[PDB]
Amino acid sequence: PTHITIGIYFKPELMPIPMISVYETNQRALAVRAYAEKVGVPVIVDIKLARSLFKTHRRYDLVSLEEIDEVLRLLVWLEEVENAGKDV
Amino acid sequence: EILSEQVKSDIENSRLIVAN
Protein backbone atom coordinates (compact mmCIF):
# COMPACT_ATOMS: atom_id res chain seq x y z
CA PRO A 1 0.00 0.00 0.00
CA THR A 2 1.37 3.29 -0.88
CA HIS A 3 -0.82 5.08 1.61
CA ILE A 4 -2.05 3.85 4.97
CA THR A 5 -4.48 5.30 7.49
CA ILE A 6 -5.06 3.57 10.88
CA GLY A 7 -7.56 5.03 13.38
CA ILE A 8 -7.25 4.66 17.16
CA TYR A 9 -10.30 4.68 19.42
CA PHE A 10 -9.52 5.22 23.10
CA LYS A 11 -12.14 5.92 25.79
CA PRO A 12 -10.96 4.63 29.19
CA GLU A 13 -14.36 5.51 30.78
CA LEU A 14 -15.77 2.72 28.62
CA MET A 15 -12.82 0.40 28.01
CA PRO A 16 -9.21 0.19 29.20
CA ILE A 17 -7.45 -0.79 25.94
CA PRO A 18 -7.42 1.18 22.66
CA MET A 19 -8.93 -0.14 19.45
CA ILE A 20 -8.33 0.03 15.71
CA SER A 21 -11.29 2.16 14.65
CA VAL A 22 -10.33 2.82 11.03
CA TYR A 23 -8.28 0.73 8.60
CA GLU A 24 -7.80 1.82 4.98
CA THR A 25 -5.19 2.06 2.28
CA ASN A 26 -4.50 4.07 -0.90
CA GLN A 27 -7.46 6.20 -2.09
CA ARG A 28 -9.58 5.39 0.88
CA ALA A 29 -6.58 6.31 3.03
CA LEU A 30 -6.36 9.71 1.32
CA ALA A 31 -10.10 10.24 1.90
CA VAL A 32 -9.82 9.30 5.59
CA ARG A 33 -7.12 11.94 6.05
CA ALA A 34 -9.16 14.58 4.25
CA TYR A 35 -12.20 13.69 6.37
CA ALA A 36 -10.39 13.71 9.77
CA GLU A 37 -8.90 17.12 8.85
CA LYS A 38 -12.35 18.45 7.94
CA VAL A 39 -13.97 17.16 11.05
CA GLY A 40 -11.11 18.04 13.50
CA VAL A 41 -9.67 14.60 14.38
CA PRO A 42 -5.82 14.78 14.68
CA VAL A 43 -3.62 13.14 12.07
CA ILE A 44 -0.16 11.92 13.08
CA VAL A 45 2.15 11.10 10.24
CA ASP A 46 4.25 8.33 11.76
CA ILE A 47 5.51 6.04 9.06
CA LYS A 48 7.01 3.20 11.14
CA LEU A 49 3.96 3.01 13.38
CA ALA A 50 1.45 3.19 10.49
CA ARG A 51 3.33 0.47 8.73
CA SER A 52 3.54 -1.91 11.59
CA LEU A 53 -0.06 -1.50 12.85
CA PHE A 54 -1.08 -2.15 9.24
CA LYS A 55 0.93 -5.37 9.23
CA THR A 56 0.01 -6.68 12.70
CA HIS A 57 -3.62 -5.55 13.20
CA ARG A 58 -7.00 -5.46 11.38
CA ARG A 59 -10.10 -3.28 11.62
CA TYR A 60 -11.73 -3.52 15.07
CA ASP A 61 -8.88 -5.30 16.85
CA LEU A 62 -7.75 -4.25 20.22
CA VAL A 63 -4.18 -2.98 20.09
CA SER A 64 -2.01 -6.00 21.02
CA LEU A 65 0.76 -6.13 23.60
CA GLU A 66 3.39 -5.88 20.84
CA GLU A 67 2.36 -2.32 19.98
CA ILE A 68 0.41 -1.19 23.02
CA ASP A 69 3.24 0.75 24.69
CA GLU A 70 4.04 2.73 21.56
CA VAL A 71 0.35 3.56 20.96
CA LEU A 72 -0.06 4.56 24.64
CA ARG A 73 2.98 6.87 24.35
CA LEU A 74 1.31 8.56 21.31
CA LEU A 75 -1.95 8.95 23.27
CA VAL A 76 -0.28 10.48 26.34
CA TRP A 77 1.71 12.72 24.07
CA LEU A 78 -1.43 13.94 22.31
CA GLU A 79 -3.15 14.64 25.61
CA GLU A 80 -0.20 16.67 26.97
CA VAL A 81 -0.10 18.59 23.70
CA GLU A 82 -3.79 19.37 23.86
CA ASN A 83 -3.37 20.47 27.50
CA ALA A 84 -0.49 22.81 26.65
CA GLY A 85 -2.80 24.54 24.17
CA LYS A 86 -5.90 24.41 26.38
CA ASP A 87 -4.70 27.11 28.79
CA VAL A 88 -3.22 29.53 26.19
CA GLU B 1 -18.17 9.22 -2.88
CA ILE B 2 -15.78 6.81 -1.30
CA LEU B 3 -16.22 6.74 2.49
CA SER B 4 -19.41 5.23 3.86
CA GLU B 5 -21.30 6.76 6.72
CA GLN B 6 -19.96 3.90 8.87
CA VAL B 7 -16.32 4.91 8.38
CA LYS B 8 -17.11 8.56 8.77
CA SER B 9 -18.62 7.70 12.14
CA ASP B 10 -15.62 5.59 13.02
CA ILE B 11 -13.31 8.57 12.27
CA GLU B 12 -15.46 10.91 14.30
CA ASN B 13 -15.11 8.61 17.30
CA SER B 14 -11.36 8.11 17.04
CA ARG B 15 -8.80 9.87 19.25
CA LEU B 16 -6.41 9.99 16.36
CA ILE B 17 -5.52 8.79 12.90
CA VAL B 18 -2.01 7.45 12.37
CA ALA B 19 -0.87 7.84 8.75
CA ASN B 20 2.11 7.32 6.49
Curated annotation (Swiss-Prot), chain B:
Subcellular location: Cell inner membrane
Function statement: Involved in a secretory pathway responsible for the surface presentation of determinants needed for the entry of Salmonella species into mammalian cells.
Family: Belongs to the type III secretion exporter family.
Name the UniProt record assigns to this protein: Surface presentation of antigens protein SpaS
Annotated organism of origin: Salmonella typhimurium (strain LT2 / SGSC1412 / ATCC 700720)
